[PDB]
Structures are given as structure tokens and as C-alpha cells.
């Protein structure tokens, strides 16, 4: 069907930040995405 926006892994930066690494289209996000609630 439709290709849902997702694919969110865990990427920890040296400051201890839980940031997400968009596998969707290869992108980065600091905190929670729109669909990731």
C-alpha cells in the first residue's frame, strides 16, 4: 500500500542525547519525529 514514514533507530551522541536516524530516506532527527509519537 502506501509507504509509511518511519524507520527510526537510535543514535547516541557524546552528550548523551537520544537522537534518531531516519532510515526512511536517510535523514537525521534530534528528538521524536511527527509520526513517531
Amino acid at each position: 500500500g502506501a509507504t509509511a514514514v518511519s524507520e527510526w533507530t537510535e543514535y547516541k551522541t557524546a552528550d548523551g542525547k537520544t537522537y534518531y536516524y531516519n532510515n526512511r530516506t536517510l535523514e537525521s532527527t534530534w528528538e521524536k519525529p511527527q509520526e513517531l509519537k
Binding site: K12, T13, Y19, Y21, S28, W30
Partner: peptide, 9 residues
């Protein structure tokens, strides 16, 4: 090694 994030507009 981790990537730095890009900033949001």
C-alpha cells in the same frame, strides 16, 4: 562513529 544532526529551520 555518530553523525552530527542538521538543524531544523
Amino acid at each position: 562513529p555518530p553523525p552530527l544532526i542538521p538543524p531544523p529551520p
